[PDB]
């Protein structure tokens, strides 16, 4: 394996979400065949952010997912080479992103170049007014669409005031390398929080747990 049970994360975003621009650092570690991972990530430009950090943070890689002998790991079999990402999140109020990461890997770290654009978000909803609590915990389905790996997530956010604010993710997933072979369909569970913050989230620790599973 090229893959170590103990890996460094690099990463840097750069973006803009209903005009605002922004660029985000991250450096952290993970456990590939665990599928756990943290890291600490630092607005480096344009904070305070004006709106919810936590449309970010499913862009801040499915190597950390533990991945079962029966169903084929894409992700790390992608590795030394790498694999790029690219992601729809469409919100129930008409708020759509686009993100993209290009994964590579150096030695012990995954580098990630990461993009993440935003619009449409209403200047009065819970996005642009900071009103998100968290990700709920969640299920990719992947499967083959077109020829290419998918990810699809119907997920929400929990906002203030008991009340949720859903979201629909779709990834498409390309290694680098010709002839790593698609995996039959299968789902990912997945956890994200954030663990600690500072006052306009311009420092956020980010934790994620994901399993691999056949729904049995």
């Given at each position: ?16 979400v209903?005009?605002?621009?922004f ?10 065949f ?34 079962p002998?029966?169903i084929?790991?894409?992700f ?60 709920e915990?969640?299920?990719?389905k ?31 997933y ?9 995996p ?33």
């Open positions: 394996s090229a893959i170590k049970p103990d890996m460094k994360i690099k990463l840097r975003m750069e973006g803009n209903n005009g605002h621009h660029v985000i650092d991250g450096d952290g570690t993970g456990k590939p665990e599928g756990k991972q943290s890291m600490d990530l630092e607005v480096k430009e344009g904070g305070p952010l004006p709106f919810a950090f936590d449309i970010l943070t499913t862009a801040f890689n499915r190597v950390f997912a533990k991945y002998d029966n084929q790991d894409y790390k079999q992608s590795f030394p080479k790498g694999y790029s990402w690219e992601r729809s999140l469409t919100f129930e109020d008409g708020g759509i992103c686009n993100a993209r990461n290009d994964i590579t890997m150096e030695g012990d770290t995954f580098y990630n170049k990461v993009r993440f654009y935003g619009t449409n978000f209403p200047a009065n909803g819970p996005v642009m007014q900071k009103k998100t609590l968290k990700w915990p969640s299920t990719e992947m499967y083959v669409r077109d020829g290419v790996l998918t990810g699809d997530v119907e997920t929400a956010l929990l906002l203030e005031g008991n009340a949720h604010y859903r979201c629909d993710f779709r990834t498409t390309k290694a680098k390398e010709k002839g790593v072979k698609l039959g369909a299968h789902f990912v569970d997945h956890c994200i929080e954030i663990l600690s913050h500072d006052k306009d989230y311009n420092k956020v620790k980010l934790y994620e747990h994901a399993v691999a599973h056949s729904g049995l």
